[PDB]
Amino acid sequence: SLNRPNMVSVGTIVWLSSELMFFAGLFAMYFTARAQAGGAWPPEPTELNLALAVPVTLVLIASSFTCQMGVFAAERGDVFGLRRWYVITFLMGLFFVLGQGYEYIHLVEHGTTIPGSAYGSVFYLATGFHGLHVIGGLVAFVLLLARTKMSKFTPAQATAAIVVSYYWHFVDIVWIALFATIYFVR
Amino acid sequence: MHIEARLFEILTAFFALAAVVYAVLTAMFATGGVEWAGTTALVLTTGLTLITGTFFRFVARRLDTRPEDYEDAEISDGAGELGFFAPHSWWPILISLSFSTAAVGAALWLPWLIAAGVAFVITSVCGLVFEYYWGPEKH
Amino acid sequence: DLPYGSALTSSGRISAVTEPGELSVHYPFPTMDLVVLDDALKYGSRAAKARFAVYIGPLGADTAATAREILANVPTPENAVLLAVSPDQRAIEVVYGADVKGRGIESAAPLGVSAAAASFKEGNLIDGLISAVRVMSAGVSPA
Amino acid sequence: ELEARRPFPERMGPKGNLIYKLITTTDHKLIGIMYCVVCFAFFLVGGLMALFMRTELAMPGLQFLSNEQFNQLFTMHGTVMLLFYATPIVFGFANLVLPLQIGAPDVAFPRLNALSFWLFLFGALIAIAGFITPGGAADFGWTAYSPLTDAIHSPGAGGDLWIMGLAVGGLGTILGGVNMITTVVCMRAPGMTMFRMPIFTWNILVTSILVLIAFPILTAALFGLAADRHLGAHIYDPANGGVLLWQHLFWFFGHPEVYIIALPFFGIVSEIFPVFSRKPIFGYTTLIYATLAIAALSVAVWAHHMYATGAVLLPFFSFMTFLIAVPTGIKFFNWIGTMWKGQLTFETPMLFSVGFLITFLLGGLSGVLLASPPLDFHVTDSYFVIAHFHYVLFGTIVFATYAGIYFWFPKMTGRLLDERLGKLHFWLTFIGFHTTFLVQHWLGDEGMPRRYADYLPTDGFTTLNVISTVGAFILGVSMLPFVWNVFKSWRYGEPVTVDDPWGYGNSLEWATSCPPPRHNFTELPRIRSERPAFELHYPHMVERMRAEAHV
Amino acid sequence: MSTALTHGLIGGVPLVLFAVLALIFLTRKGPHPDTYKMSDPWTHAPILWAAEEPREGVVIGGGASGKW
Ligand code: HEA
Ligand code: HEA
Ligand SMILES: CC(C)=CCC/C(C)=C/CC/C(C)=C/CC/C(C)=C/CC/C(C)=C/CC/C(C)=C\CC/C(C)=C/CC/C(C)=C/CC/C(C)=C/CC1=C(C)C(=O)c2ccccc2C1=O
Ligand SMILES: CCCCCCCCCCCCCC(=O)O[C@H](COC(=O)CCCCCCCCCCC)COP(=O)(O)O
Ligand SMILES: [Ca+2]
Ligand SMILES: [Cu+2]
Ligand SMILES: [Mg+2]
């Protein structure tokens, strides 16, 4: 029987709740800069494309499923299923990062930079900090997959997998808020 | 564990009320607009407590009463097996030093120092996480 | 469990209390003198490999053999030397275990007794004690 | 019946007894001790800066100091003695006794607990290291207003080290907060329910919850400012509405910060009062509600720190600031009711805990006046607000801290601090404190603004400045007896061996030895009430305790 | 005003206050009991001090005696 709370999970939950207030600053800056826009909020050089941000968002929304499948495999004692699903998750995350980088290059070429405008500052700051969190998540995947083959698959390793999944479900839920508030509510 | 769950939603109710009051009272008879800076903070302060409250509620519904949650409980009930705690480790100081190096690099804008700091941070975190999992040497 | 604010715990240990601003040791000697005697005992136990002990209290009606049944209370009673002094009745006794035999104690114990008696001509209860311990510890060989 | 003991206990350990188990340590007790030592080491440096800026401000004209030096000096004093001394001492007190109070053998995530300490120390060092540069440290106040802090108006390197040091230091606080929440929630003894743990634990729990809100937004703001200074972004541009973005973001942090360093020191005195009064705590249930109410209120109260602008909704913040002053009154009344009709004895802890009451009341009374915008219209950025926050800070951070130190020194060390050498300390620190801060109300009212390096002879205020300087040097010499006492009463001093040097002890840490073993406990009593050590000792009174409680 | 008076007063008062408060408190008697004289009856409980070195019915042999 199980009759205790997992404290490795409560620790990560409270930390993830605290980390939500970090993005509060970025959201505040965005909404403050948007207010003093006057006319068109995205200025003349800025042209947002939905031809690249939509597929990337869909990929970042398909990673959670695979991640949860890996977690489901973890709870049974399956060490191989976890590895397969986590590798797929890693690849999808890498796709997200490369897509975002490509969009950055495209935007910079047409004259939307950090020192160029007030829009550019907030846009790049918010999306760059999110990218940094994603890279941290990828590093976590690599570290966990490296640890899964050091020793026998004990419940502690399953707990580690579950908490890493928690973290991932926090990088893709904060990107559906940003995508909704940037590309739709302009 | 109901007291823990209640302590968070008690705050959640107040935070939601404060955010809603602030947003409306600023829209009318307040110079400018809706005061996006203060409104943004409170609507995420509520979320901070909401996440923890919901998680605690689910955990409390999952598991039954513990010796800690029992009024007339005996010391003999909790006897058994706690779990694992690290006796000693010298990795934390290395992690702190790595982060300090990265910070000093970022302060004076020395990209090489930043790169070195990031490499050190990754190595130190790897050392910390792979501490009680390394197997014996193979020879 | 007898004194005020004492209780017998589930492990058999005692937990006592003191009044705010009171002491719990209350020896009638200065702290620095206690430090000197402590380090003297500590460094005399080394270099001789036999632990030294000191007794201050009543020696009842025998003053020669009641200082012998109390040697059994010190840790490792064999390979241990004890100096018992009686303030009420002028008496010095030296008692040593069967593991100290032939290590130089026989020719040392009179010297320690003499040092203690000589220093007891004044109110130097603790000064003579340290002198006696120092003289006795310097005669016993580790072997 | 008759055991063998040592004439005096051992003074110190042998060679190589401390050094290695100082960098690899995992024990929470040792971490708390290190907190305390480093915090006091920083306190002395901060006090030296205050002495420097107080000496120059006794006579008109720049005698030995400069404008730049004075600016950097008050910027660094208020930073060091607020973020490098005050915040970490909270976690110092939390690491000493909280696991003992809850009946746990350890905290959750101990390696994280050590990582927090090291983050603290190195962040503090990198922030202070701004004095090594030829330019100097930060010279723009601890508040860091815009656009004074951009690269145009503050192009120094000290100001960047300031930001980066604060950012490094802030991570340890959050890690400590999550650690304390987890420890309280999970690590409890059988029969220790939520409503049976001491008030100190409740205060630390709610303080950690408040930390989890306050600090991340400050980190975000610091990152934004670094982005502006190093990448040439437009975040806090005045044309962009960024002069007041910074103020909102900063004061969302700033006021919860000043409540982070209040509640734990409420809990310390709330623990000390019942012991020396031979009487239980008064209104146990209502105290936790007061704590919860003030903690909840201290989030929607942030703009009372910016009235002199023209861009806040005055009624909202004024009303909330008025409301945040009720449960503090409840706490005061509960303390007075705890002391009422008891057997009072004034040892060193009790003396400091009483001094706290006298100081904090006037501090809070002055604080309530500032909450009305008409009154703050004349008195903001003057020497009256300085008097306010010094009275209100010096009660919780000095008197309560010293009370806790005198209380828990024997518990943690096994030695007793001297008494005739602590009364001198208290009286010096009490006489020398009012002499240096009481006349600043008049200074602020008469038209002396804050952060002034110089004044003219024909200004009127010179005598009121001499008095403050006289008083400040008594606050400098008051530290000598305390440091001497701690240094001399560590190797020597009266052995305890009684595991309760005060008697009538209430909490669970007084049910173990002085000092406690590695794993804190060798046995546990039965938890039935919130006074387990008073249940264990004096069983005869148990029935009385259940009969006289309600009136 | 009167730099001699200012400097001679911001640095003189603390020392006098310290001296007075050190006369008041540090001249009192503490809780440490008075020394035992070898001219009064021994009233304290028995002592039996011992050492802790070497670390970790009884067969014995030998003795001595004394007098003062
Ligand atoms: C948090 C708690 C705290 C503490 C403990 C103190 C301590 C003191 N403070 Fe204050 N102070 C603040 C909180 C505190 N302060 C804050 C939040 C600010 C805002 C900053 C800003 O303006 O930006 C401030 C700023 C401030 C000013 C503003 C100056 C101006 O604007 O013009 C003044 C003016 O007199 C003042 C006075 C004092 C005095 C006389 C002490 C005395 O109690 C200190 C004397 C104590 C000592 C301990 C002296 C020690 C020295 C030795 C014994 C020498 C040896 C040392 C070495 C060898 C290293 N402080
Ligand atoms: C550090 C601890 C601390 C605490 C506890 C407080 C507590 C309070 N503070 Fe704050 N405050 C600071 C630290 C603190 N503060 C600092 C550091 C600054 C300056 C920052 C800077 O700008 O540099 C500051 C500045 C500050 C300002 C801005 C002033 C200005 O910049 O001009 C205001 C304005 O509203 C304020 C109000 C209050 C109020 C109403 C309380 C209340 O918490 C106190 C209430 C207490 C009581 C009321 C007494 C007890 C009550 C009773 C006995 C019942 C009596 C009932 C009635 C009177 C009705 N303080
Ligand atoms: C005798 C003498 C000259 C000594 C001077 C000593 C001295 C006063 C040093 C100050 C150094 C610093 C960091 C100054 C800033 C103030 C400050 C923060 C002080 C330290 C504070 C402190 C104790 C905090 C905690 C410690 C901590 C967290 C770490 C400190 C940061 C560290 C470790 C940095 C220092 C490392 C250092 C000095 C290395 C320089 C060595 C070399 C050869 C660098 C030169 C160099 C250059 C110049 C390149 O351009 C370059 C480009 C691409 C690749 C490489 C390099 C490269 O190596
Ligand atoms: C200081 C923290 C800020 C972090 C925000 C992350 C930025 C995301 C990168 C987006 C690229 C856009 C560049 C652009 O259009 O302008 C470019 C300049 O931007 C940069 O140089 C970005 C470098 C930022 C450093 C990366 C992170 C720092 C590491 C610190 C770790 C502690 C070109 O502009 P320009 O040609 O001058 O008009
Ligand atoms: Ca002057
Ligand atoms: Cu305030
Ligand atoms: Mg102002």
Here the CATH number for the domain that contains residue D141 is 1.20.210.10
CA distance D99 to D107: 7
CA distance D345 to E27: 21
E30 CB within 8 Å of a chain C CB = no
Smallest CA-to-CA distance from D419 within D353, D485, D484, D345 is with D485
User: Which residues in chain D are closer than 8 Å to E1, comparing Cβ atoms?
Assistant: 59, 462
User: Which residues in chain C are closer than 8 Å to D505, comparing Cβ atoms?
Assistant: 17
3-state DSSP of D267-325: HHHHHHHHHHHCCCCCCHHHHHHHHHHHHHHCCCCCHHHCCCCCCCCHHHHHHHHHHCC
| Beta carbons within 10 angstroms of residue B134's beta carbon | 10
Q: Which amino acid is at D363?
A: G
Show the tokens assigned to D280. Answer: 């239980």
- Ligand 7 being an ion, which residues bring their Cβ within 5 A of it? D 308, 380-381
CA distance B67 to D189: 8
Smallest CA-to-CA distance from D301 within D255, D262, D257 is with D255
CA distance D94 to A163: 27
Compute the half-sphere exposure of residue E28: CA atoms within 13 Å on the CB side of its CA.
14
Secondary structure of residue A7 in the 3-state scheme? helix
CA distance D4 to C53: 8
Strands D415-416 and C91-96: unpaired
Asked whether residue D11 is assigned to any structural domain, the reply reads: no
User: Which residues in chain E are closer than 8 Å to C121, comparing Cβ atoms?
Assistant: 68
Q: In the CATH hierarchy, which top-level class contains the domain A7-183? A: mainly alpha
Chain B closest-CA separation from residue A24 CA (Å) = 6
Q: What angle do CA D150, D151, D154 make, to 5 degrees?
A: 75
D44 CB within 8 Å of a chain C CB = no
Q: Is C21 in contact with D347 (Cβ distance < 8 A)?
A: yes
DSSP letter for D449, please: B
CA distances from D427 to B67, D399, D422, D481 (A): 48, 12, 9, 11
Q: What angle do CA D166, D170, D173 make, to 5 degrees?
A: 145
Q: Please give the backbone phi and psi of residue D493, each rounded to the nearest 5 degrees, phi first.
A: 105, 155
Q: Ligand 1: which residue has its CA nearest to atom 4?
A: D81
User: Which residues in chain C are closer than 8 Å to D536, comparing Cβ atoms?
Assistant: 7, 9, 15
**Domain count along chain B:** 1
What phi-psi label fits residue C21: left (phi over 0), alpha (psi between -120 and 50 degrees) or beta? Answer: left
Judge residue D461's burial from the number of C-beta atoms within 10 Å of its C-beta, 0-12 exposed, 13-18 middle, 19 or more buried. middle
Show the tokens assigned to D454. Answer: 């110089």
| Beta carbons within 10 angstroms of residue D470's beta carbon | 22
CA distances from A50 to A173, A182, E14 (A): 19, 11, 75
Smallest CA-to-CA distance from B24 within B15, B35, B13 is with B35
CA distance D175 to D168: 12
3-state DSSP of D384-435: HHHHHHHHHHHHHHHHHHHHHHHHHHHHHHCEECCCHHHHHHHHHHHHHHHH
CA distance D152 to D143: 18
Q: Which residues contact A132 (CB under 8 A, 6 or more apart)?
A: none
User: Which residues in chain C are closer than 8 Å to D500, comparing Cβ atoms?
Assistant: 5, 15-18
Chain centroid to CA A55: 15
Residue A177 belongs to what H/E stretch?
helix A174-179
Say if residue B111 is preceded by a cis peptide, omega within 30 of 0: no
CA distance D352 to B80: 43
Chain centroid to CA A127: 10
Residue D464 belongs to what H/E stretch?
helix D463-477
Select the residue of D119, D161, D188 nearest B96 (Cβ to Cβ): D119
CA distance A100 to A82: 27
Q: Is D220 in contact with A125 (Cβ distance < 8 A)?
A: no
Q: What angle do CA A46, A53, A26 make, to 5 degrees?
A: 70
A13 CB within 8 Å of a chain D CB = no
Burial code (b: 16+ CB inside 10 Å, e: under 16) for C33-70 equals bbbbbbebbbebbeebbbbbbbbbbebeeebeebbbeb
User: By CA distance, what is C65's nearest residue in E?
Assistant: E63
Residue D469 belongs to what H/E stretch?
helix D463-477
Domain that holds residue B97: 1-139
Q: Which residues contact A4 (CB under 8 A, 6 or more apart)?
A: B63, B66
**What was the structure determination method?**
cryo-EM
- Does residue D521 have its Cβ closer than 6 Å to ligand 2? no
CA distances from D371 to B31, B105, D305, D317, D321 (A): 21, 43, 9, 8, 6
**Domain count along chain D:** 1
With contact defined as beta carbons under 8 Å apart, do A50 and A183 qualify? yes
| Closest ligand 3 atom number to CA of residue B104 | 31
Burial code (b: 16+ CB inside 10 Å, e: under 16) for D423-444 equals bbbbbbbbebbebbbebbbebb
Domain segments of chain C: what residues? 1-143
Show the tokens assigned to D288. Answer: 């936790």
Smallest CA-to-CA distance from D502 within D403, D401, D431 is with D403
CA distance D407 to D350: 9
CA distance B62 to B134: 35
DSSP letter for D457, please: G
CA distance B94 to D23: 10
Max CA pair span of chain E:
87
Q: Which of residues 105-134 of B touch D (CB under 8 A)?
A: 106-109, 128
What phi-psi label fits residue E45: left (phi over 0), alpha (psi between -120 and 50 degrees) or beta? Answer: beta
DSSP-assigned beta bridge partners for residue C96: C81
With contact defined as beta carbons under 8 Å apart, do D90 and D208 qualify? no
Ligand 3 pocket: which of B96, B97, B99, B104 to mutate (most atoms <8 Å of CB)? B104
CA distance D276 to D406: 13
Sign, Cα dihedral of D62, D65, D66, D71? negative
Show the tokens assigned to D433. Answer: 């404190």
CA distance B90 to B128: 9
Sign, Cα dihedral of D362, D368, D374, D376? positive
Smallest CA-to-CA distance from A120 within A110, A131, A132 is with A110
DSSP-assigned beta bridge partners for residue C83: C54, C94
Domain segments of chain A: what residues? 7-183
Distance D251 CA to ligand 7 centre (A): 12
- Does residue A105 have its Cβ closer than 6 Å to ligand 4? no
Show the tokens assigned to D341. Answer: 């009709």
Rg (CA), chain E: 28
Chain B closest-CA separation from residue D462 CA (Å) = 42
Asked whether residue D12 is assigned to any structural domain, the reply reads: no
Compute the half-sphere exposure of residue D470: CA atoms within 13 Å on the CB side of its CA.
21
Q: Ligand 1: which residue has its CA nearest to atom 20?
A: D78
Q: Is C15 in contact with D537 (Cβ distance < 8 A)?
A: yes
Q: Is D502 in contact with C20 (Cβ distance < 8 A)?
A: yes
User: By CA distance, what is A149's nearest residue in B?
Assistant: B133
Q: Ligand 1: which residue has its CA nearest to atom 6?
A: D81
Q: Angle between the D463-477 and E13-25 helix axes, to the nearest 10 degrees?
A: 40
Chain E closest-CA separation from residue C42 CA (Å) = 6
Q: Ligand 4: which residue has its CA nearest to atom 27?
A: A128
